[PDB]
């Protein structure tokens, strides 16, 4: 009825008063609408969007890439890919075994492994990726587990030592510039 836009319509549990036409959010965005021919309240959700990140081992090593659709359920990327309605026309090959649902998005092109290594390429939410060939996605390992042998009357004292030299690099000054506005 003149209220135009794009979104996904669904049945809403909101109870409109019988004189209202639509709804608004706390940020003055439309959240519902009443059908002029059915008098039912239809929730409106925006069509899915997000970022796209490409994981690269480096062109010096391989031309394989893995694509991360940030903030998207894999069930809706696969639906839109089949129906051909995803803005980025290029499509990563999906062999079923290379599609993984991370907490950051849908990761395509990387085979998830149950092992854990030090993080090479940080993806997010504890998941990293590396090249090992193919691209593997794993949950990063924080370090080697250790258990000190604590006891009531046991102490460990070093019998030797090591002189180590470490280097620290600190920026001190920028580059001075002067600009003539005119």
């Amino acid at each position: 009825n003149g209220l135009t836009g794009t979104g996904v319509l669904t049945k809403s549990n909101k109870k409109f008063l019988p004189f209202q036409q639509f709804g608004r959010d706390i940020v003055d965005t439309t959240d519902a609408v009443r059908d002029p021919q059915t008098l039912e309240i239809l929730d409106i959700t925006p069509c899915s969007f997000g970022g796209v990140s490409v994981i690269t081992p480096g062109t010096n090593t391989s031309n394989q890439v893995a694509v991360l659709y940030q903030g998207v359920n894999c069930t809706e990327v696969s639906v839109a890919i089949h129906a051909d309605q995803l803005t980025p026309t290029w499509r990563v090959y999906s062999t079923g075994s290379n599609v993984f649902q991370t907490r950051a998005g849908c990761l395509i092109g990387a085979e998830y492994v149950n092992n854990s290594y030090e993080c090479d390429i940080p993806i997010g939410a504890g998941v990293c990726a590396s090249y090992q060939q193919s691209i593997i996605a794993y949950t990063m390992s924080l370090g080697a587990e250790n258990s000190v042998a604590y006891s009531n009357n046991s102490i460990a004292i070093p019998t030797n030592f090591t002189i180590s030299v470490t280097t620290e690099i600190l920026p001190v000054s920028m580059t001075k510039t002067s600009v003539d506005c005119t």
């Binding site: 909101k14 409109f16 008063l17 209202q20 709804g23």
Partner: peptide, 23 residues
């Protein structure tokens, strides 16, 4: 005629827009 206090009434719905749990 006379004069009386109106208190806190006379409030109407300014539009036909649904809003839930908002100020």
């Amino acid at each position: 005629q006379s004069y009386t206090n109106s208190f806190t009434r006379g409030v109407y719905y300014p539009d036909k827009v649904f809003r839930s749990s908002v100020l």
